[PDB]
Chains A and B, each alone.
Chain A
Amino acid sequence: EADCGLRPLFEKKSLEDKTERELLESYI
């Protein structure tokens, strides 16, 4: 899918979900 993995209510809106930071911070 062309726009796969992109959430209409978050990424597409440039908004972050409550805990996704946790994930990104684990990726050294």
Chain B
Amino acid sequence: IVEGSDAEIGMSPWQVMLFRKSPQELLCGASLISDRWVLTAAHCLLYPPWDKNFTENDLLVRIGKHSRTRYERNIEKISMLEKIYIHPRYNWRENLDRDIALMKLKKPVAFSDYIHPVCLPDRETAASLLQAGYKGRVTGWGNLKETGQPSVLQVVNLPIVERPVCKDSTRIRITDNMFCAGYKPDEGKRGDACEGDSGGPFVMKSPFNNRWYQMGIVSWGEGCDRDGKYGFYTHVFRLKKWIQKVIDQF
């Protein structure tokens, strides 16, 4: 996170860390949607262009963390992955359309004050909340600047940006499955995700029932906190049917 701030303890019980077994390193962000299901971006698991292609055995999932580097004893829970499910139509050759993937933990995790799942939106909540100017929140242990590492989990709240503006800021064909977000050059406020943040959750709090819903997934961006550029996120509700499908079927 660039231009963000230290998260409060317990602020994101659903935040998850994608940890590489060897070398022991931070790969991506993720979120806990159930006691056995973690949601993250697909590009985190597979991306031929950068020779990336991990399996269940290559990594660990770390839940309940606050500090990036320290193994938080008695607090955090590390689990193993049973099965990884990437979207059958993940366009990694072009625009990362449908940048989404599911992960099934080997054994359920137990919730605590630092570990709790986030809700997936329903059409209404999505309809009503996903509107330009409406602010969401991103979290992560990624880079503090485009070109260093924070000590604890960072947080930043960004406004959703008009579809026309998003399109006009990039050379990349953006699909209905994506939505960008961030401040405009003039708004005099900054903030954006960055390396090591992708995979993470972009949530919003419903003013109707007081719950937190994850509206997007940190997908891709060109640089970090650059003027006139915005971050793009996977439209989670738009692909909920695949999420339910996988969950139910498997």
Contact present between A and B (CB < 8 A): yes
What's the tally of chain A residues with a CB closer than 8 Å to chain B?
A: 20
Residues in A whose Cβ lies below 8 Å from that of B204: 23
B13:A7 contact, CB within 8 angstroms: yes
Majority SS at the chain B contact face: loop
B117:A26 contact, CB within 8 angstroms: no
From residue B6, how far is it (CB to closest CB) to chain A in Å?
A: 10
A23:B157 contact, CB within 8 angstroms: yes
A11:B210 contact, CB within 8 angstroms: yes
User: What per-residue 1/0 map shows which CB atoms of A5-19 lie under 8 Å from chain B?
Assistant: 111111100000111
| Option from B33, B133, B157, B206 in Cβ contact (under 8 Å) with A28 | B133
A4:B135 contact, CB within 8 angstroms: no
Size bracket of the B interface = 20 to 34
- Total A-B pairs in contact (CB under 8 Å)? 70
B116 interfacial by beta-carbon distance below 8 Å: yes
* Contact of A22 with B205 at beta-carbon distance under 8 Å, contacts A9-B10, A10-B10 already known: no
| Option from B116, B119, B205 in Cβ contact (under 8 Å) with A24 | B205
A17:B8 contact, CB within 8 angstroms: yes
From residue B83, how far is it (CB to closest CB) to chain A in Å?
A: 20
* Contact of A24 with B211 at beta-carbon distance under 8 Å, contacts A6-B116, A7-B116 already known: no
Residues in B whose Cβ lies below 8 Å from that of A6: 116, 210-212
| Option from B11, B118, B119, B136 in Cβ contact (under 8 Å) with A23 | B136
A5:B212 contact, CB within 8 angstroms: yes
A5:B211 contact, CB within 8 angstroms: yes
From residue A6, how far is it (CB to closest CB) to chain B in Å?
A: 6
Q: Cα distance A6–B210 when bound, in Å?
A: 8
A27:B134 contact, CB within 8 angstroms: yes
Q: Cα distance A24–B116 when bound, in Å?
A: 21
From residue A17, how far is it (CB to closest CB) to chain B in Å?
A: 5
Q: Cα distance A3–B165 when bound, in Å?
A: 37
Taking beta carbons and an 8 Å cutoff, which residues of B are in contact with A? Answer: 5, 8-11, 13, 33-34, 111-113, 116-119, 129, 133-137, 155, 157, 159, 204-207, 210-213
Taking beta carbons and an 8 Å cutoff, which residues of A are in contact with B? Answer: 1, 3-11, 17-20, 22-24, 26-28
Q: What are 10 A-B contacts with C-beta separation under 8 Å? A: A1-B34, A4-B211, A5-B206, A6-B211, A7-B13, A8-B111, A11-B211, A18-B8, A19-B137, A23-B205
